[model samples]
Target: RKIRVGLIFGGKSAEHEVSLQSARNILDALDPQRFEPVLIGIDKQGQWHVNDPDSFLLHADDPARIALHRSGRGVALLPGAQQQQLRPIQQALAQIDVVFPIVHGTLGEDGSLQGLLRMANLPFVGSGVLGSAVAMDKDMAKRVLRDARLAVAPFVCFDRHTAAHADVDTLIAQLGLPLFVKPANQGSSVGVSQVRTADAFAAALALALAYDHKVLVEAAVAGREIECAVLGNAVPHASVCGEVVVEIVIPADIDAQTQQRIQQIAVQAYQALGCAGMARVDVFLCADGRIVINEVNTLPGFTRISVYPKLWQASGLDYRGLITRLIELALERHTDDQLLRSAV
Candidate 1:
């Protein structure tokens, strides 16, 4: 029997198109005898629709650019604390055995969807509520990792309230020029700026502030970016980078000690946020032999050209196999969670 997998995508987030692309890739790689795919798309307005399993690429309705399939059924999840169910599809009901959420930003990756699934008691891919929430907020993640005694870049977080009175001159002089300013919550390098000149500082801060109320400013780390893809729960392992025709690139050239350190720090960061299923930990390897934890992505990029899969592909797991492993982890986690009593 094939597993009924709900491939939820097209969220009301900035990464909606990326999710569409990812779902397309997964649809192509799904095996006929191994899994059943259910395409569920959330439009720009955040309405849930049970889409055509074979439905994709609708070029209409200009406001959002990508038009949702009107042929699909508008649906919603039933009370999951009772049993996991989706309603109003085909004027009937459908049961979703599991979910493989490739939704990328904001409401999708920031624990909003994860919390909904948790309330429904349904198994879905990626981190749990704790991991998703913490990892999604850059400011909070840094504080958490710092509390955990992990090395991170020198940085400061500010909101518009504080930005109004911030001594930009003193900050630049202290942290030096060539600093990076970014929205504390966005992904995919969105709302990010490199502050090189005093003239550029205000605009960069405004750009970041436009995306998120809280902004993060960090001193640039002059080094190589190293990324490690981690898999599993309780005892997670980091993928050894090396395969495939990956359209993406991740540079992981370090000595044996750095490699070990990368893996250890990756695992530590994963465990710090209670991450499970999958995550890609990014780090900065300075020319001065210092390893600084850059950031942790609970739901890293998943397109065929994205860093997450490419790093795992380098670890010897092909794209198709990585999907399989993720599903396996989700099921295992759900089963383990179910053993606990739900009653008071």
Candidate 2:
């Protein structure tokens, strides 16, 4: 008898396919003796259904076939310990101890899913509502980082209303061209482009706006990209810094001062956002060798090439251990939350 762990993936978001990939890896990594993996899928139409391992892209010749849509019995979750189970609507199914949501972007990672878990009063992986929402929005993340006095690339945020009415010349003067135009809320490098010319700037903005109502324009802070993995609740620990392979260098290819700066500020930014479980803090090593906090990913990709798990792996934690560690963190956070709420 093992702890029933609910593994939720394949959500109704742009990163649904990516979610499928992440779910596959996590399912493989879970220890059978310790965790009984429960497979749940949220389809394109936003319907929740119970799925099996095969339907979730494990060893499948062609994944993302939409193989198990309404094919399986539908299920849902309700709050309260007595009602703490996901059943197939009409029939009883099973109860899971905790949830591991790997849905990458939008509703999956943008606090909406966390809100649902919070409403159900269930413990889940990654950041809570405030951290997820703030990290998902580039605008809010930058403001928070700035208030914390952490360095973020100078950028302008625009919505559908202000985008067209924006002073093109002024923005160019302020942030400069050869900048990056991105949809503030999407991930997996979707709707992201580097504008090198004036003619392409508007097109980039248009493309970004297509993905999200709010768009982010960053003055490409020419720097070496670095990332650090932060885990735990209140007093979290930062894994050894890793560099984003921008050329020949990789993983903390800087002086001790810069390495310490990146790691320390990363933990600071993570705490400032009130994150828990796990988060990937993307940072930049400025040309002057100074570090700037780029962005935080509350639900970083779990795919093989993803930095979150890779950074931890590089720091002596293997893939299996990393997966186990996150679940442990989730259970720990849940225990703390229960104590606060259940006191007489």
Candidate 3:
């Protein structure tokens, strides 16, 4: 029997359109012989709709007209239980064995949806509530990594409320100029700014603050951006290191030793965040050849331009096979979680 997979995407985040693109790639790559893909689109207004799998007509921008039914006829997890059973509401749809959440940022990847799935006793892909929440917030992710004795960029979190009232110059002085200002919770480089001078500081902060109440400003680390993908659960395996040569015109290369060091830090970051299944750890290779942890993305984008899948591919994992592994991991993680909480 083909594994019935609920492919969830489209959410009320800045990365909504990006998520749709990812979903398209995922749908195309998933092996139909082994798995059945169910398309669920969440709109910008937070409405969930079952889209026609063959049509491919649902654009992320047309959320308002997405047409969702509240009659509860479609497949939904039974409330307040761990065992997932498929039953008809107003009509019959196959019960979802596992959820493949290709959605990125905010509600989809930041633990909100994970919480809902947990409550429904359903197994979904990617990190759990705690891992998702911690990894989504750049500041909290750094704190955990730092506490674990990992090297990370020197940074500070500025609450939007504080930035609004306090002396911006004072805060900037502490971090210095040429800092990267980003919203604490957003991804896909949305609301991220590379502030080069004092003149651009306020605008950068405003840009970041427009996305979230918390913003992270880090002293710029001049280095190549390198990344690694970690897979599995409890004794997870690390993939071959993949370098992110930023499009910027510069020497973007890391030595073999530095690459190995980065892989180690990336694996530690994944474990520290309690991330299971998969995660892409972004790191900075400083000019001095030091590896500094940047952030952990529990549900990184899977698009062609997205590094998550690309890194795995570069590491000898085929794209379609990577998708299969993620599905398998989802089921495995769910099974393990079920066993642990069976008595709870």
Candidate 4:
């Protein structure tokens, strides 16, 4: 029997449009014979709707007009625990064998959606709750990695409470000029800013605070930004990055030794964060030959132009084949999870 995949996309986050784009790419790659796609779109308001796979997005190519089909069939998941299912208010859709969540930010990439799926006892792709939660929070991830002896750029974290008392001179004194500021719990570079002058600090901090209550101020590491796609569970694999088209260059213009080191660090960070299934580790290759992890994205973007799948594709896994591997990995992870006796 063909697996019925509940492909969840669009969310009440800044990266909603990007999530929609990723959903389109995944839907295109899923093999019709082996898997059935059930498009579930979440609007800007966080209402879940069951969308038709054929015409899920309106004016899909137009950046300004791209949107969810918005089928009025609002739905919710029935966390039956024993038999997980998606329960729409008005109709009965087929059982969802697994979930392919492409939601990109906030409630989507963070532990929120993952926890819901966990309570439902349904198999979903990417990291588990702890992994998702920690990785989504920049401040937490950095501390965890640093404690684990992983190399990371120096940073100072400040929540709303502490931010008011954060002296501009003090921040600049510690992190230096041209520091990067961003929300601790947001993705897709939504609320990120590079403050070069003391004058730009307040506005930058304010912008980041607007997105999330906690913000991170990091000393900009001077190096080449490189990313590696890590896949699998227990024993994961890191794909070779040649480059991204524009700002993201793959197979990063480095030697085999540096590339190998990056792959090693990438997997280390992945495992350190308790990530399973898949993740994309972004690191900076310093001129001093240091590989410092910038961040870890548990549910990295899967858009055709996205680096995660592109890195894998460059490593010989085609788009369709990569999607198949992810689904298999999801099933593999779910099966392994069931081995633990919960009642005992």
Candidate 2 has what TM-score? 0.90
Tell me, by lDDT, which candidate is best: 4
Candidate 1: where are CA atoms >4 Å away? 59-72, 242-251, 341-343
Tell how far residue 207 is off in model 3, in angstroms.
3.6
- By the lDDT metric, which is better: model 2 or model 4? 4
TM-score of every model versus the real structure: 0.90, 0.90, 0.86, 0.95
> By summed lDDT, which 10 consecutive residues of candidate 3 come out lowest?
65-74
Report how far off residue 295 is in candidate 4 (Å).
1.5
The digit string of per-residue lDDT tens for model 4 on 1-344 reads 89989999988877789899999999999998999998899998888888888878989989999998888887776776466367878767778889998876678888899999988888899898999999999999999999999989899998989998878898788889888998998476878999999999889888999889899999988877888999998899999965434377766778998899899999989989899889999888778879889989897878888888889988888989988888999988898788873675
Q: Clashes per prediction?
A: 1, 1, 1, 10
Q: For each candidate in the order shown, give its overall lDDT on alpha carbons.
A: 0.79, 0.80, 0.76, 0.87
Query: Residue 228 error for model 2, in Å?
Result: 1.6
Q: How does model 4 score by TM-score?
A: 0.95
lDDT, candidate 2, 78-147, per-residue tens: 7554455566776666677889988655788889888888777777888988888888888888998889
lDDT of 3 by residue, 1-22 (tens): 8998888887777677767778
Model 3 bad stretches (over 4 Å): 58-77, 81-90, 247-253
The residue pairs that clash in candidate 4, if any, are: 241-250, 241-251, 242-250, 242-251, 243-249, 243-250, 243-251, 244-248, 244-249, 244-250
